[PDB]
Assembly symmetry: D2
Homo-oligomer: 183 residues x 4
């Protein structure tokens, strides 16, 4: 069974694991993690942080806000679009993008992307872009990235069955990034 | 002894500015969050500037979150703007970045000293903020109230309010917020 | 079956429910909620808030800190002690004491207690008191309270199988407490 | 002195006092948590007193948490102490409660003016904090640096540090803390 309680517990435990991590893959707009009920209809069936995850410029990061349903329309769009290709995919987290990192991830994760400059009119970038990457991959990959655009920083989006799986994948990505960030 | 005394003033100033802000219906929050900083007199490097260790971000439930503590060396980004404007007027030691809006900008030009810079002109081997601020000030003839830019590749458009201290800046932001509310 | 992940999720959801509750039974020393792994050996098999739940003078309350194992030796003493009587009891939360409230609760909940003045030497108040209240009851009751003592605020402790159940019990206790307004 | 002590001044003093506290290895935290307050000159009631809406509490994994915001009227409790002491010396506008320790007191009575009151001697229909502060001050012949009490039924003992403003209070507390650290490390 997968009800609201299950989703709130999933995200809570995912955050818990995240607090143990030396997570530095945070974009300028901050990270958020979300998970939906199975077969989500709208963003109200998707839970996330009411705040965001931001860097602590003195070292570490801050996890701001509470987990609540409908807290992130943005990521909800990604999960709702992806669920069309695979209803098992219910979670997503956006993290910082790095050119070198992506190259290295393609040999360890299923990766797909979309170009913001190719967006047609009358659509939501996140809905359109997710659809693009998924159709290109022929399913739901581990990661959906984009090199950004006018007023939009590049981004890496990690997907998975639930928020716990997502964070586990992010940990793998973080370990690789540690070496690059160090350099 | 001297530094201890000057730092205390900076901390108190930033602290009261946040206090005032918390009272406000601050909605001009950019997706990258806002921060507010203030420098000691005659700053040399970012460590002579204090600010939030976190940032001021939106709360989906409504309102906003003021995240972190006020500490020195907490904002290299903002510090770059202040130290650069300080080369045009040592009196300017505080700055805060808020949400950009075309319509609001026009209405601000009639009440504040506004200058700017464009991200595409940026010459190679330079810091965008140091360069942009310097260009914006060279262009204005001193340190204006507002320095904005339309953004660019991977960069959201921003409005930067400057002043003699954090409280000054916050007061200015409150005026701006009001001007902005007559639009929505 | 019942591992650390389960415990963390249980406490997390319990707090989630508590946050949406008009909870006013907060002691002067603040409340904390804790849950242990089955058959806990020491306080490190018990998770709880590293901070506490305290009153917000403006109104409402603040839930401070993170959920972590080994976060509370104090409540851990209570849970470890009760588990000897009934290993199915893995959670506990301390809430504000009220003489009248206890009177009303005694008719709906299984209640027991201990007296700080009767504490024998060379023991831990929480370990000894919990054991005493349970032997007095013939098992583990829903509530174990004490009228406090010198330098010690009186307290009502709510026990249960897991953190969610405990909060569910506190929700009822709170409604009853409100009849006292 | 050309200064005007208004609300802004008080908020700034409390804010800086907290900034200093966050840098301390403050372990003298009572079970009920600590709070720090400061009033405007000649306070009329607790509304003229500012303090944390929450409190300073122990972080079980190590360190402590400063909870809430600084706001006027936040603390009636510490306000009762300040307004009471101000009747003896209007210069006293701040107070912070910290964990009590008998040995620590003895080590302090040589560096600080100390006075106290007994919860068991409290008369009928009075506020413990107003009455106790009054007694302690009348017994000292003024406002001391410290007013403590050994606790009582349902009440943990406490050490209350007073001063002209929050910053002055925090400086005294730091001195006390260093002494306590030695006792702790013995
Ligand atoms: Cl989001
Ligand atoms: Cl994104
Ligand atoms: Cl900026
Ligand atoms: Cl505890
Ligand atoms: Cl207890
Ligand atoms: Cl004990
Ligand atoms: Cl208080
Ligand atoms: Cl006190
Ligand atoms: Cl009182």
């Amino acid at each position: 069974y997968i009800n609201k309680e299950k989703v709130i517990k999933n995200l809570s435990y995912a955050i818990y694991l995240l607090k143990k991590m030396n997570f530095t893959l945070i974009p300028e707009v901050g990270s958020n993690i979300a998970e939906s009920l199975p077969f989500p209809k709208d963003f109200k069936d998707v839970a996330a942080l009411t705040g965001r995850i931001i860097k602590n410029k003195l070292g570490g990061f801050y996890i701001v806000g509470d987990i609540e349903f409908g807290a992130s329309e943005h990521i909800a769009k990604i999960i709702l679009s992806a669920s069309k290709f695979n209803p098992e995919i219910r979670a997503c987290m956006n993290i910082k993008y790095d050119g070198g990192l992506i190259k290295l991830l393609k040999d360890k994760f299923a990766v797909s992307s979309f170009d913001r400059k190719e967006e047609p009119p009358n659509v939501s970038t996140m809905e359109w872009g997710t659809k693009i990457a998924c159709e290109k991959f022929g399913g739901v990959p581990d990661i959906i990235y984009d090199r950004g655009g006018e007023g939009k920083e590049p981004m890496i989006r990690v997907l998975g069955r639930d928020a716990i799986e997502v964070v586990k994948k992010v940990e793998v990505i973080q370990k690789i990034y540690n070496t690059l960030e160090g350099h």
